[PDB]
Ligand binder design. Structure first.
Ligand SMILES: [Cl-]
Ligand SMILES: [Mg+2]
Ligand SMILES: [Mg+2]
Ligand code: NA
Length: 330
DNA sequence: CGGCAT
DNA sequence: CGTAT
DNA sequence: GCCG
């Protein structure tokens, strides 16, 4: 064989695709590689999983892997075992291991990453109750993640997104007339559920947005909508108290402010997927010699920033065919 | 051999 | 270290 | 783990 470019940003990856079983197995090995501190192996297994999501048809025979980027001996053997037996011994040993299950449990807590989870694992901790019994080990961010863990493990749905966008738009409009709110993240790519809601805030007049996020946060906090926040800043990783009929649930919400000159770059970065953006930035630097992030696209020879009005402008400047958000699900 | 996004 | 995609 |  199939047509397959080597970078995920060069090919469409739709929301609904084939080979979910094969990709899920490779993503288990990627996660486990991360848990052992091998970010390179994580990245290869993620890239190989992503290739399968971009294929036109189900992989049913090993020969369909011929020539595909990021498939070598190890990834091919995993697929071969799945095709020949319906299960991969390595994947089953990993996913049934105490180490994997505990690291997954701990790293899923807001405020805990691999290095913290591994330190706790090496100290003999295994359950969330173990962490509660030792609160001296916890940052304030981790305490919030642990307190609200049950709600934060519940998928966020589109009905939640619509309610949250309304309250964020109200606070933003009270904080700065003319400011706008754009849904980004997975929901902009067409996902039906998520672990959080991501919003990008700007104003059409450059500079007006300076100092906006503390004003938005204060207005949300005064409506009783904020369970946790990190506190001059431009990103806020919040836990909202989202009203529900007769009750409420905690929801993770990310808010990001950008000046309008940077909006297309911030929109592109925060729409994702994570792998899509890593691959796009790798492409930009390695193939074009340009440095990309959510603030801009920098030419380090001329020492200039590319002025973009749209995501389409950024793709075109990089020599890439434009992909809409729903084809960025790498 | 070292990179692997910013 | 953690967080965003 | 794969590849530039
Ligand atoms: Cl979905
Ligand atoms: Mg999200
Ligand atoms: Mg987010
Ligand atoms: Na975490």
């Amino acid at each position: 064989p199939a047509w397959m470019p080597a970078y995920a940003c060069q090919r469409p990856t739709p929301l609904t695709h084939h080979n979910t079983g094969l990709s899920e197995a490779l993503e288990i090995l990627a996660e486990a590689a991360g848990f052992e501190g091998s970010e390179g192996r994580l990245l290869t297994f993620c890239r190989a999983a992503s290739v399968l999501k971009a294929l036109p048809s189900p992989v049913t025979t090993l020969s369909q892997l011929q020539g595909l980027p990021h498939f070598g001996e190890h990834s091919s053997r995993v697929v071969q075992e799945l095709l020949e037996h319906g299960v991969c011994e390595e994947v089953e040993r990993v996913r049934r291991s105490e180490r994997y299950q505990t690291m997954k449990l701990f790293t899923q807590i807001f405020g805990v990453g691999v290095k913290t989870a591994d330190r706790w694992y090496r100290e003999g901790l295994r359950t969330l109750d173990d962490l509660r019994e030792q609160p001296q080990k916890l940052t304030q961010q981790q305490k919030a993640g642990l307190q609200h863990h049950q709600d934060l493990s519940t998928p966020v749905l589109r009905s939640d997104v619509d309610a949250l966008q309304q309250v964020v738009e109200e606070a933003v409009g009270q904080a700065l007339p003319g400011a706008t709110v754009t849904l980004t993240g997975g929901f902009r790519r067409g996902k039906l559920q998520g672990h959080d809601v991501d919003f990008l805030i700007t104003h059409p007049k450059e500079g007006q947005e300076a100092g906006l996020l503390p004003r938005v946060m204060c207005r949300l906090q005064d409506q009783g909508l904020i369970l946790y926040h990190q506190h001059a800043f431009e990103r806020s990783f919040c836990i909202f108290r989202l009203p529900q009929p007769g009750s409420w649930k905690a929801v993770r919400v990310d808010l990001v402010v950008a000046p309008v000159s940077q909006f297309p770059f911030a929109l592109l970065g925060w729409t994702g997927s994570k792998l899509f953006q890593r691959e796009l930035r790798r492409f930009s630097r390695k193939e074009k010699g340009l440095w990309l992030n959510s603030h801009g696209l920098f030419d380090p020879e001329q020492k200039t920033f590319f002025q973009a009005a749209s995501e389409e402008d950024i793709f075109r400047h990089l020599g890439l065919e434009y992909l809409p958000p729903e084809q960025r699900n790498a």
